[PDB]
Amino acid sequence: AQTVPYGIPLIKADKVQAQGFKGANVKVAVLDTGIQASHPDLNVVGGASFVAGEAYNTDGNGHGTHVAGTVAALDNTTGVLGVAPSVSLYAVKVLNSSGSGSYSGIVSGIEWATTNGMDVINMSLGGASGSTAMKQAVDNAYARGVVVVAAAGNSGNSGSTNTIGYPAKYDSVIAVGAVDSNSNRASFSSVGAELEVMAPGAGVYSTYPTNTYATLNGTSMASPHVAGAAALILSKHPNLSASQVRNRLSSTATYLGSSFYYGKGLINVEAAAQ
């Protein structure tokens, strides 16, 4: 039997899936620790590794495979079910086995996705500072029509301090924070002016190596919900620009409280894909 993780109905991805829109032929690049391509619940169609010693289609860490399953776990009678179970999934490995990478590796991965005509870049990764090269890579990706999504940060709140990480903090990238199954903000979720939308992040069950399924918490889990949502909107309205898809996710989000903690609120892809 296929389990349906709470986040799938919470953002109403199931309502769009039932209309027949599943992200078919939408190309989504997951820039992460790789993907376990041989997982029975995942089809990885290509990608590239900017990490020395590791091929793009294995995942020693598990993080990239979990993030991939949330975008796109196959709709079948096993495992889990992704937000957009028909997307073309590309594994762009920019993070090693231990879950970290150079800004150079990341930049190379963004450029690879841009060069290769990805429709959506998902970055479930973050740093305290980012760089000039990274900025330009996300800007060029966005200007070229890619929807670029990143995890806001797992730094929580602390008085009035801005805790959004990079690349989420750049204007051209959707900073996604994290709610739980009760639609409440998870306490680890970063806060600040740049926070854009919320998606499910605490207690997220997805694909995990080897050939199994696991629960993780983090804005890393929330980001792919939004990446998938982007794919679903594209599959229903194929001519929308990256900026229109982004404005639809934003402007139709369910308000939850102060934008400092929630941005515009919880994505609702049914409302966004209308």
Binding site for Na ion (CB under 5 A): 39, 42, 173, 175, 194, 241-243
Does residue 167 have a cis peptide bond before it, meaning omega lies within 30 degrees of 0?
A: yes
Binding mask 237-256 for Ca ion (x = CB under 5 A): --------------------
- 70 near Ca ion (CB under 5 A): no
Q: Check 39, 63, 66, 225 and give the catalytic one.
A: 63
Q: What is the DSSP letter of 273?
A: H
97 flagged as catalytic:
no
241 flagged as catalytic:
no
Subset of residues 13 to 52 that bind Ca ion, contact rule: CB under 5 A? 41
CA–centroid distance for 62 within its chain: 15
Whether 180 has a binding-site annotation, put simply, is no
Among residues 242, 204, 196, which one has the least CA distance to residue 220?
A: 204
How far is the CA of 101 from the CAs of 119, 140, 184, in angstroms?
23, 21, 31
Q: Which is nearer to Na ion, 12 or 37 (by Cβ)? A: 37
The enclosing H or E element of 261 equals helix 259-262
220 flagged as catalytic:
yes
CB 129 within 8 A of CB 167: no
- In this structure, what are the phi and psi dihedrals at residue 176, rounded to the nearest 5 degrees? -110, 125
Q: Which is nearer to Ca ion, 10 or 176 (by Cβ)? A: 10
Rule CB under 5 A: which residues touch Ca ion? Answer: 2, 41, 73-74, 76, 79
User: Catalytic positions, please?
Assistant: 32, 63, 220
Annotated binding site for Ca(2+): 2, 41, 74, 76, 78, 80, 168, 170, 173
